[PDB]
Amino acid sequence: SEFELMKRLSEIKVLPILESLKYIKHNHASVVRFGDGEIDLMTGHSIPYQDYNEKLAKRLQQILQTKSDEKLLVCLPDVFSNMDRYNQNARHFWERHFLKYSEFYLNCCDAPFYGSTFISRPYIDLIDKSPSEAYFESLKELWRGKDLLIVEGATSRSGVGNDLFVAASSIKRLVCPSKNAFQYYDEILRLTEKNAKNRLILVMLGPTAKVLVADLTTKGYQAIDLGHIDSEYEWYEMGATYKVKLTNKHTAEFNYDEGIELEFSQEYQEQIVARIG
Ligand SMILES: O=c1ccn([C@@H]2O[C@H](COP(=O)(O)OP(=O)(O)O)[C@@H](O)[C@H]2O)c(=O)[nH]1
């Protein structure tokens, strides 16, 4: 019954984090990741930071149907095999998720392989956190010495107050809405293009990020969907063992963005090229 579905879905093949990073670097590929929220949206549901939207839903479906080629790595949650890597609560969440969406997952994902959606989630739900340093060190090699364009939300503040991007040669940021960024999609795409000349683009923008990465990739740019990497890095730096709320910025899975004390970070402010919303 349900278990038969769990087993059928284990036919989906995901390159785990460290392995995914190698594909990206070899092809200098854009990366687009599909997580639980994207499945929610595609099957018709609103999620905490993005209301359901038909065109977004169609685009996401189209993007997931794109085979991982040389220009793009398409990622799925790395939960279809070796679930034992994750804590019990994560395992329960993910199995319930892919069974709720058995109709979707049984018909959506026939590509020979996928990257790991957890390249942005390399710490908090793991039982053995040892490879995390290797994970974060390997991630950092994507931007060491690069000029970056970071497209993210107002509360995202990726790298703010930590050393995640210390080795980037420069950072420019396009700061978009923290929720429902798709309401402003046309502008976000327009300014990302204008600001992306000779830069590696990193996108932390929920479901909108996926369409952005795809459209950018169509227009020739390399764009990497990095989602909640900052939350996971903050948790890691703290040596955290559970999802603790951050006080100064957005925190993964505290997605209402309530109770935040924003700070003035002059370095962050000097990186901002434009605000949208
Ligand atoms: O309309 C939105 C949707 C989300 N985000 C940001 O998108 C990031 C999370 O992206 P995603 O859902 O892809 O993360 P994942 O959990 O898959 O890593 C966070 O910084 C959110 O603040 C945003 O700024 N605007």
From TrEMBL:
Q: Organism source for this protein?
A: Streptococcus parasanguinis FW213
Q: What disulfide bonds does the UniProt entry report for this chain?
A: 108-109
Report the protein name in the record. Putative glycosyltransferase (GalT1)
Q: Which residues bind UDP?
A: 33, 49, 120-121, 156, 177, 181, 206, 210, 228
Q: What is the lineage of its organism?
A: Bacteria, Bacillati, Bacillota, Bacilli, Lactobacillales
> What are the Glycosyltransferase GT-D fold domain coordinates in residue numbering?
31-254
